[PDB]
Amino acid sequence: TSHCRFYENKYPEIDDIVMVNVQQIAEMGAYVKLLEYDNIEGMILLSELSRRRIRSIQKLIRVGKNDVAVVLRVDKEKGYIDLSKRRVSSEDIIKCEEKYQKSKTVHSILRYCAEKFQIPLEELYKTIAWPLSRKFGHAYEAFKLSIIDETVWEGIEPPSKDVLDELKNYISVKIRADVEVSCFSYEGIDAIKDALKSAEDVKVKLVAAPLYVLTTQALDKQKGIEQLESAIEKITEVITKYGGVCNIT
Amino acid sequence: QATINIGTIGHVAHGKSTVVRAISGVQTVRFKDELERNITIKLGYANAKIYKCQEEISPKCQRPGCPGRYKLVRHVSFVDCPGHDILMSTMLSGAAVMDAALLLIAGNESCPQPQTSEHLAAIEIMKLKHVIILQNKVDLMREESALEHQKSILKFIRGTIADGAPIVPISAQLKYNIDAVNEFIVKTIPVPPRDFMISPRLIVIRSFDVNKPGAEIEDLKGGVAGGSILNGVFKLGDEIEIRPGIVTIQCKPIFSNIVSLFAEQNDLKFAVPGGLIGVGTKVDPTLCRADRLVGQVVGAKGHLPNIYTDIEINYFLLRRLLGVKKQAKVRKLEPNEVLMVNIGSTATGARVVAVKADMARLQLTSPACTEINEKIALSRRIEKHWRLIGWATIKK
């Protein structure tokens, strides 16, 4: 309905690396909820959080914020489970942070699908999660290859094909220029045509004989810096060889 | 194509456009949002048909009884100018482009209306005495009042160069009595002859780009010049010089090869003179932007018009001025004063170098082109806007 499991085991089995946020700290340590099994919660010890004794003025700035944590021990039938982040290496922080960003960007693409197609969220989640997360790594680079190699969609069935269409629909900028062709010539048309035949092959629109609205597409937003400028240069080049006058905004 | 340039003249907010509509069906538009509610800047254009019933508006004789079809006489084009005393330059331009005139007087509005009188004077000056007079707002006036008005008009037109010019009582809105007008168009206005060998000269009043908002540049259009010919059949595939030039202070003439010579509603091989024509040229539509080719002279390549600023004028003036109710005394022309000198289509601001007995020497702040002797209507600034003083000829 709202959110569910990762990989069909009720708890984070012993000595894996997950991510939590600290909820409140009074005397036990934090009541950390697990960010992978969202509604569940565990806890963690005071001496386990760093080695330093945590000030209350230090305790207030940390609550709510999330971090990474390895798991020491787990009751298989109780949710009363421990966590740990003193015994977490520096590389494992970035590795599990990348895994959890991966997790959030594969959860957000199914949350609205289940809650706007109005079906039980867990069943189609797990029918995706058996072959794609058991065959290899889970749904991020599975779905970046699924839109180009369609054998992923036919390897396992969803209970409906509208969520199929919405998942195909989710994962699958203009720089405005008002160049003023103020020409007073006889070979100007040809020049304009020539200009069109190189600056458009990005979005060029005629407004009148002088005014032209061209919205040059940028990829890094800064890659259209090298495009607009080029266009301008071309324009400058063009009109000296024909007879007219072009001025650029 | 269009056989004779027939102009429309009258007072502001009388219904010249309305009259045109009544005649042709072709609308003068009334535009630029100012002019949508009020009054046009550009000339209004319409194409009227003459195919007479001899056994008309449409080439079929189903209407006037006899099924013997409408016998082709002519096709005529309108030259409808602004009738405002502020915008008179356009009117002046129209005048030395026209071959004949059409007067418009309203019933309930007075007989010595200033603007109308001014227009009449202008017409007289510029050899346009072929005026068909139209009583317009008669769908308002009494059985006696109208008659009185007519009588007054007759009285007025006794000392003028118009002597027995025909008067017709029409409704431009109700569509009545225009048969007579049509008849007169063949009757009282014969077309003055316009040949092959008289040196080809085009007089431009309008600049046009047909560059529509939304298109791609891989599908482009050139520059179209809206201008009239009064000598020389321009045929498709000729080179042109436009001679008042382009400004650098010195000016340099513009060179354009013919894309098209378009008249009526369909593009033609030729452009036989005595008609107002849309000439597609290889020239930029950026120079045909709004109103840039207004009052410019076009000649076929291998020709010499001269671009004068210092001019020898032979001038003649009135006793008492026009444009006003309040017809003020003509005080003598004052040296180094800004007059407006209208020559064919130009409306140049000129300064007086000398005043003699019947001759004056003029400085032009904008250069005009004289090929022949050239017809002039003169204008002056006494009461803010430009009033008509007199007329001239370039003594060259």
From Swiss-Prot, chain A:
Entry keyword annotation includes Cytoplasm: yes
Positions of post-translational Phosphoserine modification: S50
Assigned protein family: Belongs to the eIF-2-alpha family.
GO cellular component: cytoplasm; cytoplasmic stress granule; cytosol; eukaryotic 48S preinitiation complex; eukaryotic translation initiation factor 2 complex; multi-eIF complex; ribosome
Record's subunit section: Eukaryotic translation initiation factor 2 eIF2 is a heterotrimeric complex composed of an alpha, a beta and a gamma subunit. The factors eIF-1, eIF-2, eIF-3, TIF5/eIF-5 and methionyl-tRNAi form a multifactor complex (MFC) that may bind to the 40S ribosome. Interacts with CDC123; the interaction is direct. Interacts with GCD1.
Protein name: Eukaryotic translation initiation factor 2 subunit alpha
Annotated compartments: Cytoplasm, Cytosol
Organism: Saccharomyces cerevisiae (strain ATCC 204508 / S288c) (Baker's yeast)
Swiss-Prot record, chain B:
Entry's EC annotation: 3.6.5.3
Effect of T90 to I/K: No effect on cell population growth
Effect seen on changing D284R: Abolishes binding to SUI2 but not to SUI3 or CDC123. Abolishes interactions with the eIF2B complex subunits GCD6 and GCD7. Decreases cell population growth
Reaction catalyzed: GTP + H2O = GDP + phosphate + H(+)
Signal peptide region: none
Annotated effect of mutating I205M: Impairs binding to methionyl-initiator methionine tRNA and impairs eIF2 complex function. Mildly reduces cell population growth
GO molecular function, one term: translation initiation factor binding
Reported impact of I105A: No effect on cell population growth
Keyword Transport: no
Protein keywords: Cytoplasm, GTP-binding, Hydrolase, Initiation factor, Nucleotide-binding, Phosphoprotein, Protein biosynthesis
Top-level taxon of the source organism: Eukaryota
Annotated phenotype, changing K137R: Increases the off-rate for GDP, without altering the apparent dissociation constant for Met-tRNAi(Met). Mimicks the function of the guanine nucleotide exchange factor eIF-2B
Similarity section: Belongs to the TRAFAC class translation factor GTPase superfamily. Classic translation factor GTPase family. EIF2G subfamily.
Protein name: Eukaryotic translation initiation factor 2 subunit gamma
Species per Swiss-Prot/TrEMBL record: Saccharomyces cerevisiae (strain ATCC 204508 / S288c) (Baker's yeast)
Gene (name only): GCD11
